[PDB]
Amino acid sequence: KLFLIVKGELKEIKKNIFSSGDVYLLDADKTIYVWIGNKCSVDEKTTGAAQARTLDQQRGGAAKIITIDQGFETKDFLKLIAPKIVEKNYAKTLLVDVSTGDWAGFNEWKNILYRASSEEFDGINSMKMVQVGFNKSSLDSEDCFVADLGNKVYIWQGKSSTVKERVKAGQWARSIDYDRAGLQQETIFEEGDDIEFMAALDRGENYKESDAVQLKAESVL
Amino acid sequence: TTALVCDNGSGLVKAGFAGDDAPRAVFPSIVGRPRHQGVMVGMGQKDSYVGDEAQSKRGILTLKYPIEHGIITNWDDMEKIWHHTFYNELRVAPEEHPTLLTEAPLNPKANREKMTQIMFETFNVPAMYVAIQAVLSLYASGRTTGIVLDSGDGVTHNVPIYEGYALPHAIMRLDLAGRDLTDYLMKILTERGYSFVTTAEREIVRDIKEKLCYVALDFENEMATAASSSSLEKSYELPDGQVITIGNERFRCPETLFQPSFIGMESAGIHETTYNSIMKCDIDIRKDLYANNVMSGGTTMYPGIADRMQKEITALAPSTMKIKIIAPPERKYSVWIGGSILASLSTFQQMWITKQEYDEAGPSIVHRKCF
Amino acid sequence: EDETTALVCDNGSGLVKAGFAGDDAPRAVFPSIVGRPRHQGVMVGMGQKDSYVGDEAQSKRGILTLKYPIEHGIITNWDDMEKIWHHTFYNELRVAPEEHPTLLTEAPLNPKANREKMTQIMFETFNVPAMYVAIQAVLSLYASGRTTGIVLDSGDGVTHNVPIYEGYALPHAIMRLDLAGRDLTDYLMKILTERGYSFVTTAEREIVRDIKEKLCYVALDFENEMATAASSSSLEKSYELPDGQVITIGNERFRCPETLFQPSFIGMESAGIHETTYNSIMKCDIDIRKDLYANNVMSGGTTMYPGIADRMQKEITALAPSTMKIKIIAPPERKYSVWIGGSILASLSTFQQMWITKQEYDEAGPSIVHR
Numbered sequence: 001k002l003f004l005i006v007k008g009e010l011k012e013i014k015k016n017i018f019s020s021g022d023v024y025l026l027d028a029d030k031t032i033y034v035w036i037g038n039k040c041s042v043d044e045k046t047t048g049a050a051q052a053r054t055l056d057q058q059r060g061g062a063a064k065i066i067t068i069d070q071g072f073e074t075k076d077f078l079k080l081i082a083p084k085i086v087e088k089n090y091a092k093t094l095l096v097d098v099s100t101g102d103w104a105g106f107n108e109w110k111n112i113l114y115r116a117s118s119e120e121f122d123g124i125n126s127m128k129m130v131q132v133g134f135n136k137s138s139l140d141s142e143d144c145f146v147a148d149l150g151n152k153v154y155i156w157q158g159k160s161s162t163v164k165e166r167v168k169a170g171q172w173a174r175s176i177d178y179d180r181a182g183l184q185q186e187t188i189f190e191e192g193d194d195i196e197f198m199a200a201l202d203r204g205e206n207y208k209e210s211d212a213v214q215l216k217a218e219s220v221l
Numbered sequence: 222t223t224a225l226v227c228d229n230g231s232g233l234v235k236a237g238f239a240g241d242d243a244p245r246a247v248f249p250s251i252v253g254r255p256r257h258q259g260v261m262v263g264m265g266q267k268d269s270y271v272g273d274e275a276q277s278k279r280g281i282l283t284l285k286y287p288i289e290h291g292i293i294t295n296w297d298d299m300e301k302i303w304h305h306t307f308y309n310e311l312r313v314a315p316e317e318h319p320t321l322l323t324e325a326p327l328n329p330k331a332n333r334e335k336m337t338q339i340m341f342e343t344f345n346v347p348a349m350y351v352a353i354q355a356v357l358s359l360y361a362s363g364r365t366t367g368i369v370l371d372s373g374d375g376v377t378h379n380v381p382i383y384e385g386y387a388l389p390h391a392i393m394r395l396d397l398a399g400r401d402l403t404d405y406l407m408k409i410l411t412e413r414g415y416s417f418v419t420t421a422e423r424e425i426v427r428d429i430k431e432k433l434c435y436v437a438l439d440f441e442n443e444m445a446t447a448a449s450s451s452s453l454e455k456s457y458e459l460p461d462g463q464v465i466t467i468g469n470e471r472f473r474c475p476e477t478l479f480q481p482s483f484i485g486m487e488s489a490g491i492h493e494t495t496y497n498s499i500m501k502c503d504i505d506i507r508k509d510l511y512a513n514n515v516m517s518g519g520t521t522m523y524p525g526i527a528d529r530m531q532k533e534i535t536a537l538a539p540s541t542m543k544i545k546i547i548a549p550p551e552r553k554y555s556v557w558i559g560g561s562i563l564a565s566l567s568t569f570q571q572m573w574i575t576k577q578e579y580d581e582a583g584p585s586i587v588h589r590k591c592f
Numbered sequence: 593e594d595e596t597t598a599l600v601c602d603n604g605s606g607l608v609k610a611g612f613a614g615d616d617a618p619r620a621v622f623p624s625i626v627g628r629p630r631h632q633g634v635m636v637g638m639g640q641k642d643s644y645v646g647d648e649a650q651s652k653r654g655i656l657t658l659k660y661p662i663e664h665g666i667i668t669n670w671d672d673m674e675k676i677w678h679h680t681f682y683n684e685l686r687v688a689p690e691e692h693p694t695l696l697t698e699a700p701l702n703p704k705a706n707r708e709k710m711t712q713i714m715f716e717t718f719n720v721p722a723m724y725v726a727i728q729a730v731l732s733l734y735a736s737g738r739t740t741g742i743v744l745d746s747g748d749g750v751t752h753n754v755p756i757y758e759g760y761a762l763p764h765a766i767m768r769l770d771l772a773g774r775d776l777t778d779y780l781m782k783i784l785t786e787r788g789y790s791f792v793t794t795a796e797r798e799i800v801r802d803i804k805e806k807l808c809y810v811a812l813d814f815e816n817e818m819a820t821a822a823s824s825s826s827l828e829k830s831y832e833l834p835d836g837q838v839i840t841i842g843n844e845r846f847r848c849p850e851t852l853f854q855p856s857f858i859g860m861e862s863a864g865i866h867e868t869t870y871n872s873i874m875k876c877d878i879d880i881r882k883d884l885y886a887n888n889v890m891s892g893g894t895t896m897y898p899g900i901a902d903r904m905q906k907e908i909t910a911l912a913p914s915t916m917k918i919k920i921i922a923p924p925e926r927k928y929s930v931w932i933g934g935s936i937l938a939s940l941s942t943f944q945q946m947w948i949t950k951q952e953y954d955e956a957g958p959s960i961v962h963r
C-alpha cells in the first residue's frame with residue numbers, strides 16, 4: 001500500500017510518482033516506511049511519524065518504523081518501489097503561517113493612531129478617543145495624539161492643547177499598557193522635539209519589530 | 222472549537238493555538254514577590270508579578286523559577302503563570318479550549334497528576350493531554366525513532382525513543398543550559414572591563430549571546446586565531462551609543478556545553494552525554510539512534526553546533542557507524558510545534574482526556590494514554 | 593434633579609488656590625495670611641474684629657500682626673488655618689461646605705499627624721460630605737500628563753524636589769529648600785534699593801512683586817549675561833510706577849531669580865535647585881533615574897521666569913553623565929498646575945470610589961485618610 005499525506009489523513013496512491021514537497025507513507029506489514037520530501041513542510045513530516053505510530057499500535061506492536069529522508073533511500077526500501085522517480089510539486093499544508101513577537105496579537109498587528117480633543121465634549125469622563133489615519137497628515141496642534149505600536153506607546157502633545165487633552169492621552173496610553181500583557185512603555189513627545197514620533201508615522205502602520213526568527217509553513221513552490 | 226498548546230519550559234513559557242506554525246505567546250516562566258513587603262502598602266504594588274513585568278521590576282522583587290530545571294516545584298506560582306497564559310497572554314477562557322501541556326522527561330507521576338488536577342479543578346478545561354517535550358520534538362523532525370538533544374533555559378536532556386516510547390533507564394539530565402551560559406558570558410565579559418549592572422545592561426548580555434555567539438569547531442585552533450588576529454572579533458552597539466568589542470567570548474561561552482569545567486561543573490559535555498545515553502540503550506537499536514540524532518531547544522541554535530556535535534560524536538562512536546545530526550531550522554520551538562500539529566490531527570482526538578473521564582476514574586487516568 | 597459638584601483647595605505656602613472641580617482655574621486666589629490686632633486697645637469698641645484673612649489683612653497691616661499659618665508648606669497653626677479655610681469656603685467661594693466633597697492638597701513629607709488634623713478639622717468643623725488629600729507635586733505631574741517623573745515645585749515660601757514612580761512619591765529622595773518666590777521678591781527689593789530706588793513700604797513691595805513677575809528672567813549663563821548687561825544697554829528695561837514715573841532696571845532682572853541657583857545671594861548656605869534636583873534623582877533606585885531625567889516637570893509660581901528651563905537643562909547636563917537624555921518640562925499652566933490637576937482629579941468618574949465619606953470617618957476616625 002502507498003499513501004500520500006494530505007492534512008492529517010492518507011490519500012491512497014498506486015502510481016509511485018514521488019514528489020519532493022510532500023511526505024508518503026508506504027505500508028509493508030512488518031515495516032512501515034515514511035518518506036519525507038526535501039522541500040515539504042513540518043506538518044507533512046510530523047503527520048507521517050504520527051500515522052506510523054498509530055499503525056504500529058494497531059498492529060499489536062511488532063512492526064518496525066523506518067524513517068527515511070529523501071535522497072538517502074536504503075536499498076531495502078528502494079527495491080519495493082522500483083523494478084529514480086522523484087517529481088517536483090506538492091500537496092498542500094494545514095498550518096496557518098503566523099509571525100510572532102512579544103505580544104500575542106502580533107502577526108495581525110496594525111499600529112494605531114488615536115486623537116483626543118476636549119473641544120467636542122464637556123468633562124473628562126465624557127471625552128472619547130477616535131482613531132485617525134496613521135500618518136503625519138492626521139496631526140493637528142490644537143489637541144493630542146497617541147500611537148499604539150504594540151511594542152511601545154508614543155504620546156504627542158500639541159503646543160496648542162489643554163491639560164484635559166494631555167490627561168486623556170496619558171489615561172489612554174496607560175490603559176493600553178494595562179490591557180495588554182507584558183510592559184508597553186509610554187513615551188511622551190512634546191511638539192517640537194518630536195523627531196522619533198514623526199519617524200514612527202514614517203515607518204507606516206504595517207511596521208512591527210520582532211527579532212524572533214520567522215519561518216514559513218509551506219513548501220517553497 | 223480551537224485547542225490550546227502550552228509548553229511549560231524551564232525558563233520560558235511557550236503557548237499558542239493548535240494549528241498555528243509558531244507559539245503566539247512567549248514569556249519568561251518566572252514569578253517575583255516584593256522583597257521588602259513595605260512596598261505593597263505605601264508604594265501600592267500587587268502581591269506577585271509574572272514574566273516580563275516581574276523581570277522589569279527585578280530589584281524590588283525576589284524572582285523564583287517555578288520550573289527551574291524542568292520539573293514544577295511550586296504550584297502557587299505555576300498557577301499564577303498558567304492563569305496569566307490563559308487569561309492575560311492568550312485572552313481566552315480555558316473552559317472552552319482543550320489544553321495540551323508538556324512535561325519534562327523523568328517527570329514524577331504525582332507531579333503530572335497534580336498538573337492534571339489543577340487544570341481541571343482550577344481552570345475547568347474541557348479536555349487535556351500531557352506530552353513529553355522531546356517526543357513532540359522527535360515527531361516534528363519527521364521521525365518516530367531517534368535520540369533527541371533538548372537544551373533549553375535551565376536544564377538539558379538526552380532522550381532516546383524507539384517507535385514513539387522513551388527509554389527511562391537511559392534518559393540523561395544535565396543541569397547546564399542557556400541560563401548558565403548567559404551567566405558565564407556575563408562573567409567573562411566583566412573580566413574585560415565591561416560592566417552590566419542596570420536591569421537593561423543585564424538583559425543586553427542575553428542579547429549578545431543570541432546574536433553574536435557561535436560554536437567553535439576546534440577550540441584550540443579558534444582560540445589561537447583570536448589570539449593572533451582580530452579576524453574573529455565582532456561589535457555590538459549598546460543603547461547609549463557606546464560600542465563593545467567581543468572576541469573569543471563568542472565561542473568560549475557555548476563551549477561550556479562541551480566543557481562544563483568552564484563554570485566549575487564536574488560533569489560531561491553534551492557530546493559525551495549523547496554517547497553515554499546511546500550506549501545505555503538496547504544494543505540492536507544504537508545504529509538507528511546514531512543515524513537519527515535530533516536537536517531541539519533554544520540552546521541548540523548557535524551556528525556551527527551541528528558540526529561540532531557530529532565531530533565529537535564520531536570521535537566517540539565505532540569507526541563503521543553512519544552518523545547524522547538533525548538540526549531543523551524550526552528546532553527552537555519544535556516541542557511547541559509538535560503539540561500544535563498533534564492537537565490538530567484527526568487520529569489524536571481519540572486520546573484527549575475529557576472531564577467526564579477525570580470525574581469517573583480520578584487523576585490517574587492521565588497515565589493510561591498513549592501518544 | 594442633578595448630581596453634586598466638588599471643591600478643590602490648594603493650601604499654598606503663600607497663596608490659597610480654591611475653586612470648583614471641572615473649572616480650568618481657581619475662582620479664588622488670596623494670600624495665605626492671618627492678621628490679628630496690634631494690642632487689645634483696638635478691639636474694645638468692636639470696634640475691630642478678632643482677626644483678618646488674606647487680602648484684607650494685607651490691607652490692614654501696622655494695626656495687625658501678620659502671620660503665615662503654612663509658612664513652609666507644612667501647617668503650623670490650626671486656629672489661623674481654620675480662619676483661612678473659613679474665609680475660603682464662605683467669603684471667597686460662597687458655598688456651604690456641608691454640600692461639597694473637598695479635595696485638599698498637602699506638601700511633600702507632610703507629617704501623618706498633621707494630615708490627620710487636617711482631616712479632623714474638615715469633617716468636625718465643616719461637616720464636609722467627603723474629603724481627599726493629595727500631594728501637591730503629584731497633582732502637578734498628573735497635569736503634565738504623567739504618573740512618573742520628578743517635579744520641581746517652587747512656590748511662595750518653599751521649594752521641593754519630589755520624585756514620583758507610578759503615582760507614588762518617594763519620600764527618601766524628597767528634597768526641600770526653604771527659598772522661593774517671596775525670598776526673591778525681598779532680594780529684588782534690596783538690589784533695587786542699591787540702585788537709588790528705595791522700596792520699604794508694603795505698597796512698594798507689591799510694586800516690586802510686579803516688577804519681578806513682569807521683568808525678571810533666568811540667565812542661561814550668568815557670567816556672560818552680567819558682562820553683556822555691564823558693557824551695553826541691551827538688557828535694560830523700563831517699568832512705569834503707578835504715579836507715571838518710569839525707572840530702569842538692568843542686571844537686577846536676572847540677578848533676582850539667579851538666587852534659585854545660587855542661594856548664597858540671600859545668605860543661605862545651601863545648594864541651588866539644579867544641584868538638589870540632581871541629589872534627589874541620585875537618591876532613587878538606579879533603575880528609574882533614566883526615567884526621572886527624561887521626565888523632569890516644573891510646577892509652581894516661581895518656575896515661571898522665562899528661560900529657566902534652558903538653564904535647568906544646562907546645569908543638570910553638567911551634573912549628570914554625558915550619555916543621559918535630560919528633558920525639562922515647563923507646562924504653560926504651571927503657575928496653577930497643582931490646582932488644575934486636582935480639578936481634573938475630582939472631576940474623574942473613576943475617582944469617586946476614593947472620596948472619604950463622613951460615614952467612614954465617624955466609624956473609623958481620622959487615620960482612614962492614609963488610605
Ligand SMILES: Nc1ncnc2c1ncn2[C@@H]1O[C@H](COP(=O)(O)OP(=O)(O)O)[C@@H](O)[C@H]1O
Pocket residue numbers: 229230231232233234372373374375376398399400427430431432518519520521522523553554
Ligand atoms: N540564537 C540563539 N542562540 C543561543 N541561544 C538562544 C538563541 N535563541 C534563544 N536562545 C536561548 O535559549 C534558551 C531557551 O530555550 P527554550 O526552548 O525556551 O528552553 P526551555 O523552554 O526549557 O526554557 C534561552 O536561554 C535563550 O537565550
Ligand SMILES: Nc1ncnc2c1ncn2[C@@H]1O[C@H](COP(=O)(O)OP(=O)(O)O)[C@@H](O)[C@H]1O
Pocket residue numbers: 603604605606607608746747748749750772773774801804805806891892893894896897927
Ligand atoms: N510670572 C511670574 N514670575 C515670577 N514669579 C511669579 C510669577 N507668577 C507668580 N509668581 C510667584 O509665584 C509665587 C507663588 O507660587 P505658588 O505655586 O502660587 O506658591 P504656593 O503654592 O507657595 O502658594 C508668588 O511669590 C509670585 O510672586
Ligand SMILES: [Ca+2]
Pocket residue numbers: 056061062063064384
Ligand atoms: Ca513495534
Ligand SMILES: [Ca+2]
Pocket residue numbers: 021022040041044090091092093218219
Ligand atoms: Ca507540501
Ligand SMILES: [Ca+2]
Pocket residue numbers: 117118119142143160161162165
Ligand atoms: Ca483642543
Ligand SMILES: [Ca+2]
Pocket residue numbers: 117119140142143
Ligand atoms: Ca482640535
Ligand SMILES: [Ca+2]
Pocket residue numbers: 176177178179180181182183184
Ligand atoms: Ca502591560
Ligand SMILES: [Ca+2]
Pocket residue numbers: 097098099100214215216217242243
Ligand atoms: Ca511563521
Ligand SMILES: [Ca+2]
Pocket residue numbers: 228230231354373518556
Ligand atoms: Ca523546552
Ligand SMILES: [Ca+2]
Pocket residue numbers: 602604605728745747892930
Ligand atoms: Ca504649591
Ligand SMILES: [Ca+2]
Pocket residue numbers: 621622647
Ligand atoms: Ca483676591
